[PDB]
Design a protein around this ligand. Structure first.
Ligand SMILES: Nc1ncnc2c1ncn2[C@@H]1O[C@H](COP(=O)(O)OP(=O)(O)O)[C@@H](O)[C@H]1O
Ligand SMILES: Nc1ncnc2c1ncn2[C@@H]1O[C@H](COP(=O)(O)OP(=O)(O)O)[C@@H](O)[C@H]1O
Ligand SMILES: Nc1ncnc2c1ncn2[C@@H]1O[C@H](COP(=O)(O)OP(=O)(O)O)[C@@H](O)[C@H]1O
Ligand SMILES: [Mg+2]
Ligand SMILES: [Mg+2]
Ligand SMILES: [Mg+2]
Lengths: 371, 57, 371, 371, 57
């Protein structure tokens, strides 16, 4: 048989059969509802547009993400997402296919328990397993040590692993992610005279953020260059014309990662959190962790982010320690690749949670030692 | 003279609509090459940006 | 049984059976009364001439229009019009034929309430329904999106529909219509030497407007050409002789639509109201609305109006959008065709307001979801 | 010397000397242009009427507001308004008086920069300053802590301040204001047969809104009572006659504030944005903000608004937390009172932007520490 | 009927000439943007080669 590797994540569901090189179906994780009444009769509009279809009907729909920060807040919407993924994007019945799910560290136990219950009850999958989004990313990089920084759309976290032994006391989680960057970009774009309020145009602002924003190696020098010259301004074409030009805002949006105080958060920057995590571990493995930094998640796709992170960590770290940052081109899909690799392992076939086991011992099986 | 003007109108409309389909094809092909030029321009632009960042680092 | 589609409109009542390709009966909505005494004894002239017959006796009657701008102002005259339509034109008993009626947007609720009360009580129609002009016009055009500009003899309104969903906050209405154009043509003909005052001559002026007026692509250039050249002058034959020649007055009457300031109206031209309505809607559907602009109504039948509208909108709209205007040859009867199509649908049979529902819920039942 | 306090607002300019109990020059911010020909010769008619004078000639002028939503969209009109305020209403030469201006949060930078440049160049004042309206409102109320809701005529916004410290990341701005309410009242008044289109009738509709509209404690119950009984019908007398009768739409218009979906807006009502702002702040100050809710702006004088907002917040807020709403009778002029008080401080005398400073630093000086 | 046909044909050919002029400035703008795109891309090519040699050394 074959195993399904579903990665719910947040803002992007990617899924595909285990053993494939790349995920087969990737689409945004949104649920759209019509906010108008409809005058034409006989069309028979559906009451809920789910997945990529909602992206084509943004102008007559209100879009809601079922996942705020890793956790699921609207279970009906998530069930709709899962049903659409299983029956439309993949067109494969889950009755005879084990499933591998991924979630971030340090999440409420009720979330995992309810996910397992829904998957065993509604879809009746033969078996399922849950993994951390960081260990799979480490698998996908062909490594066995180092720290992994998984900066997704909902949550960011750092997980140090040495020789396959995780260190729970050094795992760090920060709620700043791509969604907050998009909100900040919407907020600061007002100073230039552009107003974005509707949820539909939040997607537009996300598109500008993806296409134009970049990370500055140095902040003050870039601010001075932008204030003096105008070579950094770039123009973007909106869906209805009226091209808009953005300058200094181009690199202010991604700086929030290193400067959380822009959005009011008291927590330290990404580099400082990584550095603190590095020293939170023992002293005999700090060199390898320094030399095996791993990045994953869409938010880490900004141009020039790797250089800035390396410079900051080198400034913080002792001079006599070599610092290297691994930034493969496929950061976004690294987690799914790692999950597919893990599912293809022969030794993993005994770690599945059988339906009979769940029925006998109840939903709390996942938390028990039969992880 | 009304019939003569009708004949004038008919062959005039024929010639102008032939030119119209010709110009439609022309504008379509030029818009295609416009897209291609824009793609290559942006490709070179961000390729040079990335290599310049590599150079400075 | 079969459904009956009647369109009161304004200045022209058009009715027929559902499923037909064109209305069977089309005639002016005029009620005439004799203003003289009458000396011959025995002929027994009737006290009221209704419909097209009043045109034959136009010279001895005081023609009155029962409706001013959509709203009915003389209910007895409207009852006479409906009776003539049902009996002397279609020769059918409304006791066994559901009736579909057409009504313009943004009108007093009492209008619809009285219309339904009259239909249910006076004529005892088994069931009836009321629809909006814009939706029917879009139905007849074979489209599901776009902004439709319906300009009849009473009122000109723009309604944007996207994927069968209306945008009520973007619906625009303007009282400028064909009747105002005829009045302005009367006002502007007097400067040449021809005076038309009596209501009978209203029809002559309207016929002249229909037969000779046209829309100029450029106003200043055409005025300059007419100031010197005499190639724009055309002659018209009155019903008694003394042909009248008109020069620049032919293309100045329809300019009121784009230049309402001629007749003192504060609002802007139709070309500007359409653009404002488009910009009212959401940003994600503006391209489709631009590319699917629809025209309907008799007043939009002037030659060259489509080109002028396209030029104006292109000037207003961004240069990177393709502006396309759809002007089918049968603009005047588009609404009735749409109504016939709507009535011929099978799923529409459950949306009729049955007699029992009206009796139970009273005349107000019109304002429920059966809009 | 003394400093002048001018609040441009949106459609209502209020100005006066600093250190007064109330402004001494309040008038609408409208510029009127004659749209007709003018036959009488030697009358010496002016080509532009500004301020309250234009309110006396609404029937021969077209009125333009120079401010759409906070932002100034016509600089010539605003310059004329300022000149009229300085030389006619106040009758004081600005060459020897510091000027304090107010603007809403999240305002485009170019607006403020052009304001300062015009203020320094044309009127050549010695010093000037710009302030946020929320802080002035808080100063006027005599408080130093509490979220302030300033719903004007062009923009509404909620700003939280704790112990004199503002929280920029929790500032909320919504474009719903008095102008949108007036437009909605125009739209819904057509349900009875009253048509208001020309800009002059906008003032009539605004006066009707001010005199009659009120906020209902409950919507469904009030609508049911209005439909059943007839005790809510109230009569208003137009400048000429034909007294109009208003029923349920008396209280339906202000409901747009709590139900933006009436006008097709995505955002939630003010009662919900306030709660979202409160939850956006920290956890250890939410009690004081709950107990120190402050209202300001002209739009917040609907009879019964305070009770409705208190009920909504109490429904949203936890049961064990007490909610208090402060609604001073002088809500409309609270911003000007606060501005006068702030200008009266001796310390603030060192925060003025000297003309020499602007000359040496250019317009950008405005965005530096002298905020 | 013939006069009406002639009038409609005349309007059609006026508007066809008008769109033709529109197409004319469209070719002008698209040609200039294609030329500048080509120049910037090829200049990017030289400077990319130069910075690549710099990176190697
Ligand atoms: N090249 C890029 N530039 C900027 N942002 C990006 C880029 N690629 C992805 N993103 C951001 O990453 C987010 C997607 O994160 P994702 O990896 O899907 O998280 P999850 O795995 O939790 O769904 C998007 O919201 C997007 O804004
Ligand atoms: N060929 C034409 N050219 C110019 N105007 C026309 C033409 N045909 C009809 N009209 C105008 O259209 C009006 C009829 O509008 P109509 O379609 O009946 O509106 P409604 O559907 O509201 O009744 C007439 O008053 C007439 O002036
Ligand atoms: N009693 C009232 N009822 C309803 N609306 C009112 C009342 N008083 C004032 N308003 C509204 O408040 C607006 C004035 O707001 P204002 O405080 O002048 O804002 P700004 O200072 O930004 O101009 C007016 O447009 C009016 O419609
Ligand atoms: Mg992820
Ligand atoms: Mg009609
Ligand atoms: Mg104000």
């Amino acid at each position: 048989t074959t195993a399904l590797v579903c990665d719910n994540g947040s803002g992007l569901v990617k899924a595909g059969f285990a053993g494939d090189d790349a995920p087969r179906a990737v689409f945004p994780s949104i649920v759209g509802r019509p906010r108008h009444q409809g005058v034409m009769v006989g069309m028979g509009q559906k009451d809920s547009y789910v997945g990529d279809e909602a992206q084509s009907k943004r102008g007559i729909l209100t879009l809601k993400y079922p996942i705020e920060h890793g956790i699921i807040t609207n279970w009906d919407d998530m069930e709709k997402i899962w049903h659409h993924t299983f029956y439309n994007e993949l067109r494969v019945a889950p009755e005879e296919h084990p499933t591998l799910l991924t979630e971030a560290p340090l999440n409420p136990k009720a979330n995992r328990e309810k996910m397992t219950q829904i998957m065993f009850e509604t879809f009746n999958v033969p078996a399922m397993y849950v993994a951390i989004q960081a260990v799979l990313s480490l698998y996908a990089s062909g490594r066995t040590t180092g720290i992994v920084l998984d900066s997704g759309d909902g949550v960011t976290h750092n997980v140090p692993i040495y020789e396959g032994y995780a260190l729970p006391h050094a795992i760090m989680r920060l709620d700043l992610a791509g969604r907050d960057l998009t909100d900040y970009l919407m907020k600061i774009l007002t100073e230039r005279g552009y107003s974005f309020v509707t949820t539909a145009e939040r997607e537009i602002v996300r598109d500008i953020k993806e296409k134009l924003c970049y990370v500055a190696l140095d902040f003050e020098n870039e601010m001075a260059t932008a204030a003096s010259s105008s070579s950094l301004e770039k123009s973007y074409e909106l869906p209805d014309g009226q091209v808009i030009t953005i300058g200094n805002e181009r690199f202010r949006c991604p700086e929030t990662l290193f400067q959380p105080s822009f959005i009011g958060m008291e927590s330290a920057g990404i580099h400082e959190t990584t550095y603190n995590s590095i020293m939170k571990c023992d002293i005999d493995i700090r060199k390898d962790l320094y030399a095996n930094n791993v990045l994953s998640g869409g938010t880490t796709m900004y141009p020039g982010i790797a250089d800035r992170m390396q410079k900051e960590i080198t400034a913080l770290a002792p001079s006599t320690m070599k610092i290297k940052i691994i930034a493969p081109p496929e950061r976004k899909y690294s987690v799914w690749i790692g999950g597919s690799i893990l599912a293809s392992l022969s030794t993993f076939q005994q770690m599945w949670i059988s339906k009979q086991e769940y029925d006998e011992a109840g939903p709390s099986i996942v938390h028990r030692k039969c992880f | 003279e009304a019939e003569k003007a009708a004949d004038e109108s008919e062959r005039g409309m024929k010639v102008i609509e032939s030119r119209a389909q010709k110009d439609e094809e022309k504008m379509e092909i030029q818009e295609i090459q416009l897209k291609e030029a824009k793609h290559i321009a942006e490709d070179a632009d961000r390729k040079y940006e990335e290599v310049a960042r590599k150079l400075v680092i």
